[PDB]
């Protein structure tokens, strides 16, 4: 999957190549929204790791399988 | 058919088709308006979306 | 009626045709702004929709008859 | 004559030819920033500004 | 009196020509600054009015006499 | 002697001659910012800056 | 290895090569976001970000 | 040791040139910015003051001995 | 109806409402971008003097 | 269907949905970059017509049929 | 009666009022636009004088009369 | 397998899947930017069309 | 007696209080603009040296 | 180690880690800004390959070995 | 005594303390500008020297002496 | 000691630490912008590689 995160007052996004499912990264991230963790990590297919400030996420895109 | 989300600060738009009704769309952005709008488009990619941070949405004409 | 609409900070505006009176759309963005809905939805004369974000509106302007 | 209404965290000025006296366009605006000012030009364009992305707003000489 | 009045997240300066003395535009800015009255009003040597949201300001800048 | 005011979300620097030791501009602006800072320069210009919107001051060597 | 920040409302990421696991790194970071975070590079140079600032920190593949 | 200043909401960092150590300076960043005392003053090889509002600090880079 | 006009280097693009068709102003956009100047008038009679070369895209609603 | 213009020197894309197939809005798109001289017409599945000036074209972006 | 003029590059509008006709202020500004060299200069109704860089115009909007 | 394309004076990068080979994207870019269009197809069949003089740098991932 | 000065490129304009009439300074810019320097000097004796090729526009006040 | 790439008009630069030796990055980007004509291509550590419009680098920043 | 340099393209003045005389200073910027080609250089009056790319120059602003 | 480099349409500048004298940094600048590239290294040995066509200015500190 293709996993794109837009942040807060960036015009940049972060793009990643996922080996999670779509569902397994809609689960991550509607879950670290929900419950403020602060941080959400999301890690890609190579395991480099993304911690994001939650509160600075603007949304995140999740390509197809 | 084409949403359109304006994101608060930043001059790009998250635009898709959606296979959903206009009606439909507008229920879940109203909802989650009054922190998390989830979209998914005609194909699948899913469009996780911080309430704060939307500006607008258009929704086009139906079909 | 062509109606425009500033969002706070972003320099291009929603700009459509309305095919409602200039007293209607007012009616509706000034109640919109005053009783804190959250939400203000505008329609154009093809029935597109627009819901906005009432705190993110900067402005409308409303064009004549 | 000229209004200059200078909106917060844009460049773009809302510019119109008003009908309305300088003291009366001072007291809306005055009144307004003590969440809408609703001002209307000559053409009966109708402004509706949210008072809190107010910047400024210059008032030209009358005539 | 040249004065310049610099606005907050704006790079354009609101610039005009007084016809009041630097002491009498600092006391204006100054008492609107420190009194929380809102709105701060200076007027230009033609009339023209400068209606400012007194929050939004950064810095007022008076030239010399 | 020169002097250099950075001002929050703004490219440009307020930037004058000072008369005053740079113990004294530092105490002025060490006041402040513990609403207003008020600074004027060598020829008698007043700044007259919103504290809040201070990002750093920059006060040159001596002379 | 590489180690990116980026910072909120910038454009600008601070990119800077660790000799820390990532783990290590990771550890800093979340410990931090839950006001400062501290991090040295493999060189000595320090990095002090306040952390309500930080958008993101990307870590690379370990090596 | 060069140190170079990121400023919240601008691109332009402050850098300059100190004599201190670079532990010297870590001390006063880190004690700044953890009792709240509002500035932050850090002054360069020649005299030079910066003066900086402590909440509108992004980073502190700190540079090799 | 709508016809918004993209300028380059600049995020505010012109829109006005037109009492011409879309075929009028499609050729006169065409026409123009092959002395420099666009002229195109709304439907109160406003002006828009545009400079072609500046011109990123025309944008022209659906008819009537 | 969905067709993404990019600008030059522009954050904001072109977006519309075409009635074409892919490979007729190629072959008009090539074309037009290739002969790049003037315009590029495109018109959308409601019949908005899209003027494009060549020269200020970054890309073109055609989705899956 | 009210004229702008966009300049390339630039977010901000040149805006001030006219006492000439729609048709007189059309003809200078095609006239300079034509003769593509140097200044476009207009007098508003209390006697300013803007003076554009010809090259440098992106739009002219002439207001009703 | 990862493609991100930098466009001149803009901030948002082009980024997309590929099927092909890293040899085969940089190969069509190397010859494009020797009739001023680069034609990229993701995995899924979406076409990029890029006015060559525009792209800033492309960057491409690790095969597979 | 305002005079403001817009360059090419940036949002920050030049602005000093002239002690010339309105038609020495119109002259100057006029002329500068058909060897790529325009000088003007404000009422305090500050010097503005502009590249004439990066000048937007000159607003000039009215007299006095 | 640690190579940073600038680019004409944007604030992002494009950094990598080079398994290569200072001296032959250097060589690499010298003849290619040199030969100023189509491309600088690099390899990261990892195999990403850069390919760089030689005419749009501002600068290249080599790191230590 | 103060010069500040402005650059195109860019929101940002060079400014320094000057210990040559206005005149000095109009008659080193003047011949640059006019032998436009390469540099501008300037020394200010603690011996920092700015080399200035004269055709990326907006304006001079000299201060009173 | 510090050497500053401002680089057009980017309001990032290049700071380093020069081991290098005044002298020495101002005029590998001015014969540079008299091949298109200028090579600085600072005293770590970071080697900084600059198109001379896209420096704005080069500030050059106090020496020692």
Do not use: C, M
Not at 17 to 43: F, H
């Amino acid at each position: 999957v293709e996993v794109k995160i837009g942040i807060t007052d960036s015009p940049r996004e972060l793009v990643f190549s996922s080996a999670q499912t779509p569902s397994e990264v809609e689960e991550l991230v509607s879950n670290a929204l929900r419950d403020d963790s602060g941080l959400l990590t999301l890690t890609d297919e190579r395991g480099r790791r993304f911690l994001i400030h939650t509160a600075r996420i603007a949304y995140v895109e999740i390509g197809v399988a």
